[PDB]
Swiss-Prot record, chain A:
It comes from Saccharomyces cerevisiae (strain ATCC 204508 / S288c). The chain holds residues 1871 to 2422 of 2493 of the full protein. It comes from the Eukaryota. This is U3 small nucleolar RNA-associated protein 20. Involved in nucleolar processing of pre-18S ribosomal RNA and ribosome assembly. Belongs to the UTP20 family. HEAT repeats lie at residues 20-57, 83-122, 250-287, 488-527.
Swiss-Prot record, chain B:
Belongs to the UTP14 family. Interacts with snoRNA U3. Interacts with MPP10. Component of the ribosomal small subunit (SSU) processome composed of at least 40 protein subunits and snoRNA U3. The chain holds residues 225 to 300 of 899 of the full protein. Present with 1470 molecules/cell in log phase SD medium. ATP binds at A28, N29, L30, L31, K32, G33, K34, S35. It is found in: Nucleus, Nucleolus. This is U3 small nucleolar RNA-associated protein 14.
UniProtKB/Swiss-Prot annotation, chain C:
It comes from Saccharomyces cerevisiae (strain ATCC 204508 / S288c) (Baker's yeast). Required for ribosomal RNA processing. Interacts with snoRNA U3. Interacts with NOP1 and MPP10. Component of the ribosomal small subunit (SSU) processome composed of at least 40 protein subunits and snoRNA U3. It is found in: Nucleus, Nucleolus. WD repeats lie at residues 21-61, 63-98. Belongs to the WD repeat DCAF13/WDSOF1 family. This is Protein SOF1. Present with 6620 molecules/cell in log phase SD medium.
Curated annotation (Swiss-Prot), chain D:
Component of the ribosome, a large ribonucleoprotein complex responsible for the synthesis of proteins in the cell. The small ribosomal subunit (SSU) binds messenger RNAs (mRNAs) and translates the encoded message by selecting cognate aminoacyl-transfer RNA (tRNA) molecules. The large subunit (LSU) contains the ribosomal catalytic site termed the peptidyl transferase center (PTC), which catalyzes the formation of peptide bonds, thereby polymerizing the amino acids delivered by tRNAs into a polypeptide chain. PROSITE patterns: RIBOSOMAL_S7E. The lineage of its organism: Eukaryota, Fungi, Dikarya, Ascomycota, Saccharomycotina. Disulfide bonds: none annotated. The keyword Cytoplasm applies. This is Small ribosomal subunit protein eS7A. InterPro entries: Ribosomal_eS7 (IPR000554), Ribosomal_eS7_CS (IPR047861). There is a cross-link at K81, K82, K104 (Glycyl lysine isopeptide (Lys-Gly) (interchain with G-Cter in ubiquitin)). GO terms for molecular function: structural constituent of ribosome. Belongs to the eukaryotic ribosomal protein eS7 family. It is found in: Cytoplasm; Nucleus, Nucleolus. It comes from Saccharomyces cerevisiae (strain ATCC 204508 / S288c) (Baker's yeast). Keywords: Acetylation, Cytoplasm, Isopeptide bond, Nucleus, Ribonucleoprotein, Ribosomal protein, Ribosome biogenesis, rRNA processing, Ubl conjugation. It holds the Pfam family Ribosomal_S7e. GO terms for cellular component: 90S preribosome; cytosol; cytosolic small ribosomal subunit; nucleolus; nucleoplasm; small-subunit processome.
C-alpha cells in the first residue's frame, strides 16, 4: 500500500517531487527489495527505476549500487527470463547502467549478457535484452565477448525474419562500428561482409544490409567512404542488374543516386570510366544495357553533361539502337526500352532535341513505335508527345507526312488488342493534337506515292481520315474485351476531334463517328449486356451529345 | 521500369574483369574476397546436431590421450 | 537427473546450465572418474547420452532395445563404462566407438 | 485478380503477396490455373518458430482444403521458391469435440506424411510427455519441419506435443 501510494504520488505530481524528499524513501526501497512478496519487489523496482531516471546524490548512488547488487541476486535466483521479476530486474539494471556513473562487476555484466543472449532472436523477449545491450554499448563498457555479441547482432541483422529485431540489431551494430575501436583488418572484414551479404538468398536480408550500407554512406566520412565506395558502387550495380526483387533493384538505384554526390571527384571519375567501359563493350546486349542504365542514373544524379565524352558515347549507343530499332532487330526489347528512357531523360535535360541528329533519333522513336513491344510503344508515344511541343521549337519542324505517319502509328497502336490505359490516353491526346494541327493547317489526307491504295481517298482531310480510322477501330470487334478500353479512348478522342474540328468537318465526320457509336446504341434492353459494352455505350452517348452540340 | 525489366545475368567478377584498369581492381579491395556471405540459417535441431557432432569429435580427441 | 538434466553449483541456488537432449526424462547419471568433465546419463527412451562440460553440451546418444538402469565408469580407463540393462545383461562400452 | 483469388473480403499485405504468387502459378500452368480457379483461401496467419523463424499457416474452407490436399505438392514447391525460407502449411478453420478438432489440425499439419502413432508418458511427479510418431516415407525434409510443426501446433491448439520419426534415431 505504501509503495502504491508513493508510485501514485510521483507519477501524478512532478513539481511536488523533489530530489531532497525522496532521499529518505530510498532506504525503505532497499529494505523492501529483500521482501519475499513478488508484488512488493516489482513495485519497489518500478519506483527505483523512476528514481534512477531522476537525479540524486552520492549517498543515494551508493544505495543504488546496493539495489543493483540485490537485483543481480534476484536475476540469479529467477530461473526464466520470461518471469516478470527477472524482466523488471533487467529493466532496473538497464536503467542503472544508463543513468548512473557507477558500474557493476564485469563478471556480473557478462553473466547478465549470457542470460539475455538467447532472447535476442525471439520477438517476445528481444526488446528488453536489446535495451540492456544498447545501455552497455552507450556506456561503452569493455567486455571480452562484446565482439562476439556484435557478430551475433550482424547475424540477426542478416537472417532474422522480424523487421523490428532487424532494425534494433542494425542500430546496435552501427553503434558498435562507429564507437568501439577495432583493427583495420576487422573493419575491412566487416565492410567485405556487408558487400558479400548484398548477394544473399533472402530479399529481406538483402534489404536490411542495404539500409545498413545507406546509414554507412550517409554518416561516413568521404575519405573513408571512397575506398569502400568503389566496391559499393560495383556491388550495387550488380544488385541493380541481377537481383530478382524489383524493390531491391529500385532501392539499389536510389542508393547509388544518393552515394553519387557524396562521392569524391576521383571516385566519380572512376565510375565514369567504368560507365564508358560497359558502354564501349557493346558486344553483349545486356552488358550495354547495364552500361546505359548506369549512365542514365549517373546523369540524373550528378547533372547533365558532366562528362561530355561519356554523354557522347551514351548518345552514340542510343543512336545505334535507333539505327537498329525496327522489328526483328538484334537488340533486346528491354534494352530498347532502357535506351528510350535514357533518350527521354536526355531530351528532358537538354535542348539537343532541336538538332537534326535528334530528328534522326525521333525517326528511330517512330521505328520504336512500329516495334511491337507495348512498353517501347508507350515510351515512343511519350517521346512523340514531347516532340509535339518541341517540334515548333525545333530547328526543323515535323512534316505533314511525318505527322500523318505518326497518326497512322497511333492508329496501329489503338487497333492492337492489348494496350495500357496510360498509353491509350496518350494516343487519344496525340490524335486530338494531330487533329487540331490538321484543322489549323487545313491539311488534306496524304497518300504516299510509293504505297498507293489504288482507290480514291475515303476522307478528304487528314483530321477526317484520323476520325474515320478511330471510328473503324472502335467499330472493329475481333477482340472486343481487349479493345474495349481502346474503343472508349477512341470515343473520347472522337469527341475531342469533333470539338476541335470545324462545323463542316464535324458534319462530314459525324456519320463516321456515329457509325461506331450506333453499334452500342442499336442494342436496346439486351438480356446479357457486357459492362465494357455499357461503358462504350455511355461514351458513345457522350460523343453523340458533343456532336449534337457541335452541329444542330 | 528498369527494375521490372529482366537481367542475361552478368557476374560482378565479370564486370571487374571487364574493367580495363588494373588500378581500379586494386582499389576495389573490399570487392575481392573469399565470399564470406552467410548461409541461410538451418533449423535449430539440425544446427544443434552439427554442434554436438563437433563436440563429439573434440571429446574423442581429448580422451584418446589416455590410450597410451 | 529427472525431467531435464541440470548442471548445478553449490554456490548458486539455481541450475547453472541445462544439458538435456530433447524432451525426454533422464533416470541416472555418472561422472567420469579420470576425465572428470565427461558425464553419462540414462533415459527412459532406451537411450544412453554422453555429455562434455568443456563444450557444455550433450556429446552423443545411443538407443538400445531396452532401458538401461545404471552406469559406471572404469577407474583405470577413462573411456570405458558398463551399463546395467533390462535385457538381463550388462554391456561394456568404449566411448569412442558406440 | 488477387482480390478474387483471396476469399477474404479485406486482403492483407501477405495475403495479397500470396494471391499474386497464386496468380503467377496460374499463369505458369493452365492445369494449375484450372485447379486454382475454384480454389480460394479464407485467411492467412504467420506463426513464430524458435530460432527467429516464422512460418505461414493458410486457412482454407473444407472442400477447397480438399483441393489443396489434392494439389499440395506443386503448390508448396512453387511457394517455397516464391516466399523465401518460410514453411507454408494449409489448414482449415475448425471452430470450437475439441479433441477431434485438434486431431484434424494435427493431420492437416503433418500432411501428406502419415501419423504412425501417438503416445503419452506419465512420469513420477505428474509430468507428461506427449509424442506423435510420423511416417518415414520422405525423411530428410520432415527432419527440418519437425520444430516448425511443433511450434505451429502449440500455438494453434495450446498443447505442446513432441514430434518424432521412430525409424531414425534423433
Amino acid at each position: 500500500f505504501a509503495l502504491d501510494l508513493l508510485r501514485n504520488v510521483i507519477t501524478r505530481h512532478r513539481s511536488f517531487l523533489t530530489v531532497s524528499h525522496l532521499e529518505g524513501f530510498i532506504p525503505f526501497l532497499r529494505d523492501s527489495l529483500l521482501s519475499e512478496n513478488e508484488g512488493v519487489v516489482i513495485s519497489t523496482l518500478r519506483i527505483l527505476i523512476t528514481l534512477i531516471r531522476l537525479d540524486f546524490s552520492d549517498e543515494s548512488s551508493e544505495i543504488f549500487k546496493n539495489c543493483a547488487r540485490k537485483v543481480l541476486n534476484i536475476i540469479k535466483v529467477s530461473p526464466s527470463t520470461s518471469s516478470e521479476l527477472c524482466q523488471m530486474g533487467l529493466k532496473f539494471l538497464s536503467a542503472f547502467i544508463r543513468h548512473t556513473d557507477s558500474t557493476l562487476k564485469d563478471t556480473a555484466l557478462s553473466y547478465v549478457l549470457g542470460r539475455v543472449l538467447p532472447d535476442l532472436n525471439e520477438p517476445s523477449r528481444q526488446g528488453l535484452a536489446f535495451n540492456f545491450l544498447k545501455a552497455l554499448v552507450s556506456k561503452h563498457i569493455m567486455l571480452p565477448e562484446l565482439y562476439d555479441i556484435a557478430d551475433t547482432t550482424r547475424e540477426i541483422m542478416v537472417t532474422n525474419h522480424s523487421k523490428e529485431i532487424r532494425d534494433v540489431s542494425r542500430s546496435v551494430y552501427y553503434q558498435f562500428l562507429m564507437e568501439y575501436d577495432q583493427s583495420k583488418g576487422r573493419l575491412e572484414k566487416q565492410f567485405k561482409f556487408m558487400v558479400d551479404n548484398l548477394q544473399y538468398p533472402t530479399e529481406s536480408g538483402r534489404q536490411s544490409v542495404m539500409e545498413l550500407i545507406n546509414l554507412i554512406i550517409t554518416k561516413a566520412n568521404p575519405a573513408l567512404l571512397s575506398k569502400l565506395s568503389s566496391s559499393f558502387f560495383l556491388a550495387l550495380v550488380n544488385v541493380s542488374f541481377n537481383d530478382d526483387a524489383p524493390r531491391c533493384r529500385e532501392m539499389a538505384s536510389v542508393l547509388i543516386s544518393t552515394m553519387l554526390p557524396k562521392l569524391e571527384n576521383k571516385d566519380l571519375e572512376i565510375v565514369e570510366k567504368y560507365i564508358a567501359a560497359w558502354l564501349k563493350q557493346v558486344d553483349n546486349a545486356s552488358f550495354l544495357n547495364l552500361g546505359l542504365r548506369t549512365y542514365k542514373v549517373y546523369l540524373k544524379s550528378i547533372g547533365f553533361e558532366h562528362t561530355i565524352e561519356l554523354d557522347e558515347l551514351a548518345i552514340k549507343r542510343i543512336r545505334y539502337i535507333l539505327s537498329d530499332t525496327s522489328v526483328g532487330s538484334e537488340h533486346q526489347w528491354d534494352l530498347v526500352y532502357s535506351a528510350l528512357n535514357t533518350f527521354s531523360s536526355y531530351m528532358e535535360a537538354t535542348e539537343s532535341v532541336y538538332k537534326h541528329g535528334f530528328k534522326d533519333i525521333w525517326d528511330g522513336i517512330i521505328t520504336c513505335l512500329l516495334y511491337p513491344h507495348s512498353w517501347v510503344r508507350q515510351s515512343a508515344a511519350n517521346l512523340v508527345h514531347q516532340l509535339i511541343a518541341n517540334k515548333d521549337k525545333l530547328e526543323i519542324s515535323l512534316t505533314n507526312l511525318e505527322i500523318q505517319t505518326i497518326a497512322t502509328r497511333i492508329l496501329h497502336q489503338l487497333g492492337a488488342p492489348s494496350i495500357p490505359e496510360n498509353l491509350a490516353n496518350v494516343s487519344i491526346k496525340t490524335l486530338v493534337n494531330i487533329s487540331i494541327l490538321w484543322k489549323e493547317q487545313r491539311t488534306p489526307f496524304i497518300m504516299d506515292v510509293s504505297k498507293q491504295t489504288g482507290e480514291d481517298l475515303k476522307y478528304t482531310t487528314a483530321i477526317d481520315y484520323m476520325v474515320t480510322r478511330i471510328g473503324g477501330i472502335i467499330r472493329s470487334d475481333e477482340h472486343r474485351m481487349d479493345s474495349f478500353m481502346s474503343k472508349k479512348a477512341c470515343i473520347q478522342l472522337l469527341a475531342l476531334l469533333v470539338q476541335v474540328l470545324d462545323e463542316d468537318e464535324v458534319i462530314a465526320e459525324g456519320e463516321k463517328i456515329l457509325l461506331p457509336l450506333y453499334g452500342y446504341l442499336e442494342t436496346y434492353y439486351s438480356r446479357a449486356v457486357d459492362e465494357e459494352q455499357e461503358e462504350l455505350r455511355t461514351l458513345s452517348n457522350e460523343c453523340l451529345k458533343i456532336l449534337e452540340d457541335k452541329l444542330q | 521500369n528498369e527494375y521490372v525489366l529482366p537481367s542475361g545475368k552478368l557476374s560482378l567478377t565479370d564486370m571487374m574483369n571487364v574493367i580495363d584498369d588494373r588500378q581500379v581492381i586494386e582499389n576495389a579491395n573490399l570487392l575481392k574476397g573469399k565470399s564470406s556471405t552467410y548461409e541461410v540459417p538451418l533449423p535449430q535441431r539440425i544446427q544443434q546436431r552439427h554442434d554436438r557432432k563437433a563436440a563429439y569429435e573434440i571429446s574423442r580427441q581429448e580422451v584418446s590421450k589416455w590410450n597410451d | 537427473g529427472g525431467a531435464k538434466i541440470h548442471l548445478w553449483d553449490v554456490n548458486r541456488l539455481k541450475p547453472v546450465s541445462d544439458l538435456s537432449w530433447g524432451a525426454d526424462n533422464i533416470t541416472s547419471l555418472k561422472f567420469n572418474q579420470n576425465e572428470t568433465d565427461i558425464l553419462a546419463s540414462t533415459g527412459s527412451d532406451n537411450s544412453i547420452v554422453l555429455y562434455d562440460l568443456r563444450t557444455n553440451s550433450p556429446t552423443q546418444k545411443i538407443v538400445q532395445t531396452m532401458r538401461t538402469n545404471a552406469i559406471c565408469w572404469n577407474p583405470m580407463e577413462a573411456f570405458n563404462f558398463v551399463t546395467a540393462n533390462e535385457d538381463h545383461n550388462a554391456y561394456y562400452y568404449d566411448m569412442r566407438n558406440l | 485478380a488477387p482480390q478474387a483469388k483471396i476469399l477474404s473480403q479485406a486482403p492483407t499485405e501477405l495475403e495479397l503477396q500470396v494471391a499474386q504468387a497464386f496468380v503467377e502459378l496460374e499463369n505458369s500452368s493452365p492445369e494449375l490455373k484450372a485447379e486454382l480457379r475454384p480454389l480460394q483461401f479464407k485467411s492467412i496467419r504467420e506463426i513464430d518458430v524458435a530460432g527467429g523463424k516464422k512460418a505461414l499457416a493458410i486457412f482454407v474452407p473444407v472442400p477447397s482444403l480438399a483441393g489443396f490436399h489434392k494439389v499440395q505438392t506443386k503448390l508448396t514447391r512453387e511457394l517455397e521458391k516464391k516466399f523465401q525460407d518460410r514453411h507454408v502449411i494449409f489448414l482449415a478453420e475448425r471452430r470450437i469435440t475439441l479433441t477431434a478438432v485438434h486431431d484434424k489440425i494435427l493431420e492437416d499439419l503433418v500432411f501428406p506424411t502419415e501419423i504412425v502413432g501417438k503416445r503419452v508418458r506419465y512420469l513420477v511427479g505428474g509430468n507428461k510427455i506427449q509424442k506423435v510418431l510420423l511416417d518415414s516415407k520422405d525423411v530428410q525434409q520432415i527432419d527440418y519441419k519437425l520444430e516448425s510443426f511443433q511450434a505451429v501446433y502449440n500455438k494453434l491448439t495450446g498443447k505442446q506435443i513432441v514430434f518424432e520419426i521412430p525409424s531414425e534415431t534423433h
